[PDB]
Amino acid sequence: FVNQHLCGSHLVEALYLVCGERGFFYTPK
Amino acid sequence: FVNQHLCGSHLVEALYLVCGERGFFYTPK
Amino acid sequence: FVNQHLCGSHLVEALYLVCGERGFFYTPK
Amino acid sequence: FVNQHLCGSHLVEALYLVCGERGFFYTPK
Amino acid sequence: FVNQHLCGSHLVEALYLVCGERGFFYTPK
Amino acid sequence: FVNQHLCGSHLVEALYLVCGERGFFYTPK
Amino acid sequence: GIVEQCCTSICSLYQLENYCN
Amino acid sequence: GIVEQCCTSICSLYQLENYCN
Amino acid sequence: GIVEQCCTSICSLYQLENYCN
Amino acid sequence: GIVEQCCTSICSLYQLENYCN
Amino acid sequence: GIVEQCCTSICSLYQLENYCN
Amino acid sequence: GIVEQCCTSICSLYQLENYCN
Ligand SMILES: *C(=O)CCCCCCCCCCCCC
Ligand SMILES: *C(=O)CCCCCCCCCCCCC
Ligand SMILES: *C(=O)CCCCCCCCCCCCC
Ligand SMILES: [Cl-]
Ligand SMILES: [Cl-]
Ligand SMILES: [Zn+2]
Ligand SMILES: [Zn+2]
């Protein structure tokens, strides 16, 4: 599902910004 | 350190693509 | 100054996410 | 509307490039 | 087709990462 | 050289938008 | 506004330029 | 997970923050 | 071309590599 | 301006909010 | 090349067009 | 960490894979 792939790319950029020094795991599944 | 912040933005984009369904972990320094 | 140009590209991405429906203003130096 | 959110992210990057030294307001609503 | 425009933007970023020192042509048509 | 790698990521995004249906060529140094 | 114009149809750089200062 | 929550509906920065460490 | 192949289905990095120089 | 403030140090999300409309 | 030209100074949109096909 | 490894030199795709889960 390409639109899902594209959405995930923006998700990870947003987590990078929100989480800051905290870091994050990205766990799609 | 802004340059580290800009590098990390590109690193998470790359991890998203490299890691696929595994996802990834990002922790800044 | 290219490094300022690269910083600003990330700043507008961040403003888009932070500011939501308010939108934002970007003026370079 | 997530696809609208994703489109806006690319819009702001394109305005950053086109407007250059002029700057811009991003006014979604 | 805006979704096509958005997809292409992510395509070119992925080619940049995969191709590395090799470079690439982006030939949509 | 990481800073060159970050610059090039922004250059291909800009070429994608500037060049339209012509596409573009990217070759790193 | 820019979202109704340019998320319903592709805006060229020349159309986007209308939104600059 | 984050894709089902935030690709079906817009997540604000406050909702995204739930996924941070 | 790359848009018909990789905007209709997800292309992995290995499939994208076909488009490199 | 935002460049002088947020390209010389990392701005927090609340600092960035000063450039919202 | 584009890196030497446009990573050492900001290239205008018309300078970038030299790297279109 | 990834910042110390991959912001001081360019990491290959296989080096980046060390930060997958
Ligand atoms: C925490 O805020 C900083 C810790 C890591 C800093 C990395 C410094 C690396 C070299 C960058 C030099 C840039 C310009 C002289
Ligand atoms: C206009 O073109 C430039 C005005 C602002 C320039 C900012 C300089 C800030 C410090 C960056 C140093 C980078 C490497 C030594
Ligand atoms: C190959 O790996 C490098 C060849 C081109 C290198 C460009 C160096 C340009 C000036 C950047 C200086 C950055 C900080 C002092
Ligand atoms: Cl950058
Ligand atoms: Cl997208
Ligand atoms: Zn996108
Ligand atoms: Zn960057």
UniProtKB/Swiss-Prot annotation, chains A, B, C, D, E, F:
Changing R22Q: In MODY10; reduces binding affinity to INSR; reduces biological activity; reduces folding properties. This is Insulin B chain. Changing H10D: In HPRI; Providence. It comes from the Eukaryota. It comes from Homo sapiens.
